[PDB]
């Protein structure tokens, strides 16, 4: 989309592998403010943001909090204190053309800078002057928004670059968003520290001898002590025996 | 449609300066208003910039000594010089900008020496 | 981004086909527009967007050009002609060019 009218598409419910962007060399600019991406594996949130756009190289650097200029002021506006990443890669073989492409659009008049995440698509005339322009094109009026021209030949600081912007939201809501958290292998008849699903503790795993229903995951003996699990990837019940102990 | 801007002069170097630009058929809160200046025989420099939005920039070599303003009752923008060096020396346009500047007025003249 | 404009002084007579060169340091696209200034008066916008005559510029004013290499070309110059041009980096911090004087041949 046009830097003017940068789509947004809301991620939700799923596993974010941040890897596959911050170990990509497809990207010119990965710059994430107030968050490491590699610890984002470890968090989740409600929501994440990708707002996707399309600016010039120049423009690239207008993609920060605290930034002013065309694209800040008028097009797209990060707030102060953005937490978040911004990621940026050059697209000459994709956005321009021998003849030009001028499919891409910025908003070159305002009455006002626009607020945080704020997006302005209106094709309104821009009274430049104390005459209303009532829609109507002249001296003191002229159209918001101008075509940008890319080229294969451009300079690298006027070539085409496609910008998406990560922001998390977390509400008063569950957190959907989550990364990987990767497992490993699992051994028996030997005392280890284990942490299954949402539980942790120490002891032996053997084979079992019960039947847990479907749905069933721990197990409790009777004075509120786990006693078997569910693997969460092998369809197979574990007894948890307790390590040995006993006085000296 | 004219741009008026007055308020050149004489001044010693480290002083300071207000330059106005009263504009008419224009609105300078609404457009893209810009200072230039040209020193004693020398091309056109661009000094500073504000935005319809209220934004302002600047040249490097003004930075952090000039600040432009406007004023929207009385249609009019301003330039505010201080620490003002020999350097400064030119006479100085008022202009919309449409980096294309299609109005500009007659310029005032600031000697700094 | 460095304009070079070239050359500094070209002597014409009236009527002649006068062409001014702006030289980008790299690609600018069409971003480039062109003034004309006489002795004592403020610059005048001829051409903006490197090819589209400001509205009342007489048709001789011709601009043109893309990528890194940009003219103006005068068609008929006539004696209201003889003036400094310059030219201006467009979309970008308002780089101007040295300018051009165009001065009467003889």
């Known amino acids: 989309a046009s830097v003017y009218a940068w789509n947004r598409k809301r991620i939700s419910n799923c596993v974010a592998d941040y890897s596959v962007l911050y170990n990509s060399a497809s990207f010119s600019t990965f710059k994430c403010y107030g968050v490491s991406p590699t610890k984002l594996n470890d968090l989740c949130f409600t929501n994440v943001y990708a707002d996707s756009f399309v600016i010039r190289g120049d423009e690239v650097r207008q993609i920060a909090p605290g930034q002013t200029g065309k694209i800040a002021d008028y097009n797209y506006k990060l707030p102060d204190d953005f937490t978040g990443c911004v990621i940026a890669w050059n697209s000459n073989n994709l956005d321009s053309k021998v003849g030009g492409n001028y499919n891409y659009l910025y908003r070159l008049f305002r009455k006002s800078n626009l607020k945080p995440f704020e997006r302005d698509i209106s094709t309104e005339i821009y009274q430049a002057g104390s005459t209303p322009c009532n829609g109507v094109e002249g001296f003191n009026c002229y159209f918001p928004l101008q075509s940008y021209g890319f080229q294969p030949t451009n300079g690298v600081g006027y070539q085409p670059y496609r910008v998406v912007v990560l922001s998390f939201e977390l509400l008063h809501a569950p957190a959907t968003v989550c990364g990987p958290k990767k497992s490993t292998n699992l051994v028996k008849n030997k005392c280890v520290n284990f942490n299954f699903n949402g539980l942790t503790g120490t002891g032996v795993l053997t084979e079992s001898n019960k039947k847990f229903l479907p749905f069933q995951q721990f197990g409790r003996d009777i004075a509120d002590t786990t006693d078997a699990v569910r693997d969460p990837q092998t369809l197979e019940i574990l007894d948890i025996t307790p390590c040995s102990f006993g006085g000296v | 449609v004219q741009l008026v801007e007055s308020g050149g002069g004489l001044v010693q170097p480290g002083g300071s300066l207000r330059l106005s630009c009263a504009v008419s058929?224009?609105?300078?809160?609404?457009?893209?208003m810009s200072w230039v200046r040209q020193a004693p025989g020398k091309g056109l420099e661009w000094v500073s910039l504000?935005?319809?939005?209220?934004?302002?920039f600047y040249a490097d070599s003004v930075k952090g000594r000039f600040t432009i303003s406007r004023d929207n009752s009385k249609n009019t923008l301003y330039l505010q010089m201080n620490s003002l060096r020999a350097e400064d020396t030119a006479v100085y346009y008022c202009?919309?900008?449409?980096?294309?500047?299609?109005?500009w007025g007659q310029g005032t003249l600031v000697t700094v020496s | 981004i460095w304009m070079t404009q070239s050359p500094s002084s070209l002597s014409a007579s009236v009527g002649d086909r006068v062409t001014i060169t702006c030289q980008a340091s790299?690609?600018?696209?069409?971003?480039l527009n062109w003034y004309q200034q006489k002795p004592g008066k403020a610059p005048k916008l001829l051409i903006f967007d490197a090819s589209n005559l400001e509205t009342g510029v007489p048709s001789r004013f011709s601009g043109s050009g893309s990528g890194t290499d940009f003219t103006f070309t005068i068609s008929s110059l006539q004696p209201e002609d003889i003036a400094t041009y310059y030219c201006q980096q467009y979309d970008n911090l308002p780089a101007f060019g040295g300018g051009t004087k165009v001065d009467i041949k003889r």
């Open positions: 058929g224009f609105t300078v809160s609404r457009n893209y």
């Open positions: 504000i935005y319809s939005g209220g934004s302002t």
């Open positions: 202009a919309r900008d449409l980096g294309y500047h299609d109005y």
């Open positions: 790299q690609d600018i696209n069409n971003y």
